[PDB]
């Protein structure tokens, strides 16, 4: 089992991973190029050793959605990327989904093995968010992109029959296995 602060550090890691996930996704659909500087002398806000600037409005949107809860079996967190054209027609481009299965794992050191793997998964997410079809559409902007974070219950059928999905990646923790992916039309 996990010691008392093993459980709390893990919970702090999952939270900030989830908050960083929404930043990356929203910053990748924002319309412009993203550039952050490396740094040999770290800062106390660069979670997972990655320079990701926070947008305050997005943090607040993220936190209200989670309502201080973290994802778990049944409770997943979803970022909906949608398009509203000037004709008012709205459609979801992608639904990014941060889930948690019950396949636990007491064999990983919570402190810094889970931490570094959450970090790699964020790096995969930076790569993946650039090479799904909504990325190129978001860099041209007629139509604008909208983002909405919710904490379900994920529901995807609005994307339309035949949608595709890509696995961003997977991280095992003593509380379960973190799955992150994108269903995209």
């Amino acid at each position: 089992d996990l010691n008392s602060q093993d459980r709390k550090d893990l919970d702090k890691f999952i939270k900030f991973f989830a908050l960083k996930t929404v930043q990356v996704i929203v910053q990748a659909r924002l319309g412009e190029k993203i550039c952050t500087r490396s740094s040999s002398s770290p800062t106390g806000s660069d979670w997972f050793n990655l320079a990701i600037k926070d947008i305050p409005e997005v943090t607040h949107e993220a936190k209200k959605a989670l309502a201080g809860q973290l994802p778990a079996v049944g409770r997943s967190m979803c970022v909906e990327i949608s398009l509203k054209t000037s004709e008012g027609d709205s459609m979801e481009l992608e639904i990014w989904c941060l889930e948690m299965n019950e396949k636990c794992d007491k064999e990983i050191k919570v402190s810094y093995t889970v931490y570094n793997r959450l970090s790699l998964l964020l790096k995969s997410l930076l790569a993946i968010t650039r090479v799904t079809p909504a990325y190129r559409l978001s860099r041209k902007q007629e139509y604008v992109i909208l983002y909405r974070i919710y904490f379900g219950e994920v529901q995807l059928s609005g994307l339309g029959e035949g949608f595709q999905t890509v696995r961003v990646g997977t991280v095992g923790t003593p509380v379960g296995t973190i799955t992150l992916s994108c269903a995209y039309r």
């Binding site: 993203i34 550039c35 490396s38 740094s39 040999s40 050793n49 320079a51 090479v131 860099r139």
Partner: protein, 214 residues
């Protein structure tokens, strides 16, 4: 920890070869590097922070992400150029590959150099084709970009699929796991090399690949 190897294949126009290799090495290295380790004598150490940036391709409808280290980008840009001119002086063949392999150094007894043990190799086989119109040069910008998309997706899937990574080292052993020569970023120890290949047939593996389609 026996050596994992991965192979990707791409077909590009002449102008596109450098960006497509740059797109592939940087996404692998973005997964295969870390913040600069800063050890203190007590054994404690701190990790720096990695920045990233978007790079728009000029000859491919594509964007990739690289760590924000400009020595590293200079490093790979020069050897990616050594690959491309080598393809150009290959004349006919039209083919060549490039490989990236991560290894650890094991200390060796005199007089032998430290043995370099790969734990992972990446290989990219390129097939340059030259195009005639300037609208199949334009149209080509689109599907190379669509195909690098799935190459990036596959790289990412393989990295979650890959379990082994080097044990994180102490201050005495860090130079046997990481390239500590950069200021911005700490890549795993790595070598990239290439080869200009000669073409021959494709071996009626086509039927096996035709069975997968049906």
């Amino acid at each position: 920890m026996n050596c994992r190897s991965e192979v990707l294949e791409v077909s590009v126009e002449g102008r596109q070869v450098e960006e497509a290799m740059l797109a592939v090495l940087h996404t692998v290295l973005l997964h295969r590097s870390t913040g600069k380790f800063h050890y203190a004598a007590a054994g404690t150490y701190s990790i720096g922070t990695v920045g990233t940036q978007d790079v728009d391709c000029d000859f491919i409808d594509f964007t990739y992400v690289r760590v924000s280290s400009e020595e590293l980008d200079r490093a790979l840009r020069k050897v990616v150029g050594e690959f491309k001119d080598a393809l150009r002086n290959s004349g006919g063949d039209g083919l060549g590959q490039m490989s990236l392999e991560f290894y650890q150094k094991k200390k060796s007894r005199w007089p032998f150099s430290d043995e370099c043990i790969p734990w992972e190799v990446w290989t990219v086989k390129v097939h340059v084709v030259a195009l005639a119109t300037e609208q199949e040069r334009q149209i080509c910008r689109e599907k190379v970009g669509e195909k690098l998309c799935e190459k990036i997706i596959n790289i990412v899937e393989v990295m979650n699929r890959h379990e082994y990574l080097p044990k994180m080292p102490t201050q005495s052993e860090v130079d046997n796991v990481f390239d500590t020569g950069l200021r911005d970023v700490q890549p795993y120890l790595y070598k990239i090399s290439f080869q200009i290949t000669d073409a021959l047939g494709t071996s009626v593996t086509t039927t096996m690949r035709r069975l997968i389609k049906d």
